C-alpha cells in the first residue's frame, strides 16, 4: 500500500531525527568557548588576472598551486600562471555556455562543461602543441553544474537532471550513476581520500555518495533554499554547504547533523562559492553581494572581508598549500588574495 | 629585467594569447546574441525556419550583422539558476502562438495555454536579471488565428473583453494584454509584430529591433540616458 509505505518512510524519518537529537549534547559553538579567536585577517590582492571578456563562472587550482584554470561565458578557458600573470594557453570552447571547470590532479587534463550537457575534457600535454578535446562525455539531461577529477581516468560530474555520474575517460560511458536527489544537483566536492564525495542540490540537501559502491550513505538537509556550493573539510569527516539562505553550514559526516551555521544579519544575499583553508580553521565563502567573507570554523564569527570585487563572485578556491585564494567574479577579473 | 629568456618568451606568448583574445572579443562585441523563448505550443521552431541535448545555437548573418540565436526550450530544469547565464543578451525573442487562446495544456486541462504563455512572459520580462534586456514579441500563427477566431470570442481566454471578433481588433487586444505584464515599462521596450507560417520578412523586424536595442545600449553607455 502506498499509504503504508509513506507511513514507513515517516517513521524512518522520525527515528533518524530522534537519533540525531540523542547524539547531540552540546553544539560546536559551546565546545569552542575557550578556543583563541582567529582575529581579523588583513588580506590583499597580490595578483589580478585580467584577460577574460565575460562573466567568469568557475575557476579551479592545479595541484602545483601555481596554475589556475578559469572558465568564462566568452567561450574560452584560460590557464594562468599565478605567480606571474601569464596565460599558459587559452582553449576556445565549442559551447560558449560554461558553468564548471576542473584541473586534473596530475595536471595533464582540463575539464569543462555547462548548458551544453557535455563534459568536454581537453588534453594539455600534447605532441602537436595545441589543446585538443580528448573526450566529449554525453548522457546528462541537464546543465553540468560541477565536474571534479578523481584521477586521470575517472571524473565525477553532477548535472541538473538530479543525477551525478562517474565517467571513465577512455570508454566515455558512466561507470556508476548516482541518483536520488529530488532537485537538480548543483555542486559536488570530493573527499581527500577520493573515495567519498558529497553533492549539494536544489532540494536543500547534501548527499554523501560512495564512489565505489554507488549509493547515498547519508543525506543532510538543514537549509531552506538552493545549495550552490560545497567543499569538504580537509580532514574528510566534514564539509561546508553554501545556500541561498545566506548561511553556510558545517555538516559532520560521522555526527550526521549540522554542526554550526554561519549567519549574519547584514548579509541577506546568497552564497555562490565556498572553500576552506588548508588547516580548516577558516571558511572563505563567496557571497552574492560582490564580496567574499572569511568566517571562523570553530566559531561563527567574521574573521575577515575580502572586499574588492566589482560584481558577483562565482568561483572561489584555495591552493593545496594554502598560500593564496582565487575569488574570480562576474566582472571578468580573477583575483589572487593573500 | 630580472627575467629569464624562457620567462621572457613565456610573457611574449601570453601577449600573443592576449592579442588573440582581444581580436575574438572585438569580433564578438560587434556580434549580437538573442535568446529565443517559447511556451505551451511553442511554435518558435516553425519561425526558426523563417530566419534560418541542451542549448541550440543558430548563427545567421543579415545585412552584415552576425546574429547568434539561442534556443533553450529543451533545457527542462530549474530555470532560475541558469537564466542568469544569459545576462547581457541584446534582446529576448518571445514567440507566443495565438492558437493557444483556446487550446488547453496537455496536463491540467483546467489551465489555458495562452495564460501559461502570459505567466512565462511575466516571469521572463519582469525577472531581475533581464532588467535592461529588451523583448521581441512575435505573435505567430496568425493564419490559424484568423481561421479560428470567428468560431468563439476571446472570452474563453480573456473574459475581460469588450471588442469584436475580427482579426485586427483581437490581435490588438492580445498584443496589449501581453504588453501590460511589463512592469518596468521605462527600462525595457517590447517590440511586437505579428507573423504567420509563410513570412519572409520577420528577419527584417528582428534586424530593426536589434539595431534599436544596440543604439539604446550605446546611448546608455555614453550616458545620455
Amino acid at each position: 500500500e502506498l499509504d503504508q509505505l509513506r507511513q514507513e518512510a515517516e517513521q524512518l524519518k522520525n527515528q533518524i531525527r530522534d537519533a540525531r537529537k540523542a547524539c547531540a549534547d552540546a553544539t560546536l559553538s559551546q565546545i569552542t568557548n575557550n578556543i583563541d579567536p582567529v582575529g581579523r585577517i588583513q588580506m590583499r590582492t597580490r595578483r589580478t588576472l585580467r584577460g577574460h571578456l565575460a562573466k567568469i563562472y568557475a575557476m579551479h587550482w592545479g595541484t602545483d598551486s601555481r596554475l589556475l584554470v578559469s572558465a568564462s561565458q566568452d567561450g574560452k578557458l584560460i590557464i594562468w600562471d599565478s605567480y606571474t600573470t601569464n596565460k599558459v594557453h587559452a582553449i576556445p570552447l565549442r559551447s560558449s555556455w560554461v558553468m564548471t571547470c576542473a584541473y586534473a590532479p596530475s595536471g595533464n587534463y582540463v575539464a569543462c562543461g555547462g548548458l551544453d550537457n557535455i563534459c568536454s575534457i581537453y588534453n594539455l600535454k600534447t605532441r602537436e602543441g595545441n589543446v585538443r578535446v580528448s573526450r566529449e562525455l554525453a548522457g546528462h539531461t541537464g546543465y553540468l553544474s560541477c565536474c571534479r577529477f578523481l584521477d586521470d581516468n575517472q571524473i565525477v560530474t553532477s548535472s541538473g537532471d538530479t543525477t551525478c555520474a562517474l565517467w571513465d575517460i577512455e570508454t566515455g560511458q558512466q561507470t556508476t550513476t548516482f541518483t536520488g536527489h529530488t532537485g537538480d544537483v548543483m555542486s559536488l566536492s570530493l573527499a581527500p581520500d577520493t573515495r567519498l564525495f558529497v553533492s549539494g542540490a536544489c532540494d536543500a540537501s547534501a548527499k554523501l555518495w560512495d564512489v565505489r559502491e554507488g549509493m547515498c550513505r547519508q543525506t543532510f538537509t538543514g537549509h531552506e533554499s538552493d545549495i550552490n556550493a560545497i567543499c569538504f573539510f580537509p580532514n574528510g569527516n566534514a564539509f561546508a554547504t553554501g545556500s541561498d539562505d545566506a548561511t553556510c553550514r558545517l555538516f559532520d559526516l560521522r555526527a550526521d547533523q549540522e554542526l554550526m551555521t554561519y549567519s549574519h544579519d547584514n548579509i541577506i544575499c546568497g552564497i555562490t562559492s565556498v572553500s576552506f583553508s588548508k588547516s580548516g580553521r577558516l571558511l572563505l565563502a563567496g557571497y552574492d553581494d560582490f564580496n567574499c567573507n572569511v568566517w571562523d570554523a570553530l566559531k561563527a564569527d567574521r574573521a575577515g572581508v575580502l572586499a574588492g570585487h566589482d560584481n558577483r563572485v562565482s568561483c572561489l578556491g584555495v591552493t593545496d598549500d594554502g598560500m593564496a585564494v582565487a575569488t574570480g567574479s562576474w566582472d571578468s577579473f580573477l583575483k589572487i588574495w593573500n | 629585467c630580472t627575467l629569464s629568456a624562457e620567462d621572457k618568451a613565456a610573457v611574449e606568448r601570453s601577449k600573443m594569447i592576449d592579442r588573440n583574445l582581444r581580436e575574438d572579443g572585438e569580433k564578438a562585441a560587434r556580434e549580437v546574441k538573442l535568446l529565443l523563448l517559447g511556451a505551451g505550443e511553442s511554435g518558435k521552431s516553425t519561425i526558426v525556419k523563417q530566419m534560418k541535448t541542451g542549448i541550440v545555437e543558430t548563427h545567421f548573418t543579415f545585412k552584415d550583422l552576425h546574429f547568434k540565436m539561442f534556443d533553450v526550450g529543451a533545457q527542462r530544469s530549474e530555470r532560475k539558476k541558469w537564466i542568469h547565464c544569459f545576462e547581457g543578451v541584446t534582446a529576448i525573442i518571445f514567440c507566443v502562438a495565438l492558437s493557444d487562446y483556446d487550446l488547453v495544456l496537455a496536463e491540467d486541462e483546467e489551465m489555458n495555454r495562452m495564460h501559461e504563455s502570459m505567466k512565462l512572459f511575466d516571469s521572463i520580462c519582469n525577472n531581475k536579471w533581464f532588467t535592461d534586456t529588451s523583448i521581441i514579441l512575435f505573435l505567430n500563427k496568425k493564419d490559424l488565428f484568423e481561421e479560428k477566431i470567428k468560431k468563439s470570442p476571446l472570452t474563453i481566454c480573456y473574459p475581460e473583453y469588450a471588442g469584436s471578433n475580427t482579426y485586427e481588433e483581437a490581435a490588438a487586444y492580445i498584443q496589449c494584454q501581453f504588453e501590460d505584464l511589463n512592469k518596468r515599462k521605462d527600462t525595457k521596450e517590447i517590440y511586437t509584430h505579428f507573423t504567420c507560417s509563410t513570412d519572409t520578412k520577420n528577419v527584417q523586424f528582428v534586424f530593426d529591433a536589434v539595431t534599436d536595442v544596440i543604439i539604446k545600449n550605446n546611448l546608455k553607455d555614453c550616458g545620455l540616458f
Partner: single-chain antibody
Amino acid sequence: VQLVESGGGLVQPGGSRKLSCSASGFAFSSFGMHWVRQAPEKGLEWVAYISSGSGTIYYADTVKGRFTISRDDPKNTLFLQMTSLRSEDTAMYYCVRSIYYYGSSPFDFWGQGTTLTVSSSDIVMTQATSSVPVTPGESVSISCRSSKSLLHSNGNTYLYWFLQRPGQSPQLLIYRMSNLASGVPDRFSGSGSGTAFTLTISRLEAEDVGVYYCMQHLEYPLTFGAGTKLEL
C-alpha cells in the same frame, strides 16, 4: 610531427642560399623555431631563433647581419636566408621547435637537418671528459660545468641535456636539470647545484649510445657544450 628541411648542398663561397624547413604535423604558429648548426666533425652551436608571431628574432654573434630567419606561418614553413658565406659555416643545420610557457618543453623536437658545404660574454660550458667508455647495464654520470650560475632567481634551473644518436637528429633528454621530456625512459636522471650539473644513467642500452650535449638557457646566446660521446 615532422620538420624536414630543404636547401643546401655545395655552395660557392660568399654567395647566398636559403634553407626551408617544412613544418607538418603540429601547430607551427604557436611554436618558436631555432636554427642550430653542426660542424662536420664538431659539436653544436646556436645560430638563430624566431618566436611565435616573429616578434622576437635573435641571432648568434657569428651570424649577425649576414643571416636572416623568417617564418611563413600560413604556409607552415621556416626560411633561413644566408648571405656572405665563409668557410666556418660548412655544417649541418637543424630546425628545432620550442614552445615557451610554464612547464613547457623547449627544444622538444628536432628536424633531420640539411647539410651545407662551401668551397675554400657568453657562458662557456665544458664537458671535460668528452669521452667515456661504457658497458650496458651500468650506472654512469656525465658532467657539464657552467661558467655562471644557471639557477635563476625565479627558482628554475636552465640546463638542458640532449642526446644525438649516430647519424640521426638530436632528441631531448632532460629540460631544466630535473624534468624529463616525454618519450624518455625513467633511467635517465639529472642533478646539479646551480654551477655543476650531471646526468645519471641507471642502466645503459644500445639506444643510450651517441653524444650527449648540455645547453644553457639564461642568456639567448644559448651556448651548447662539447658533448660527451658514448662508446661500447
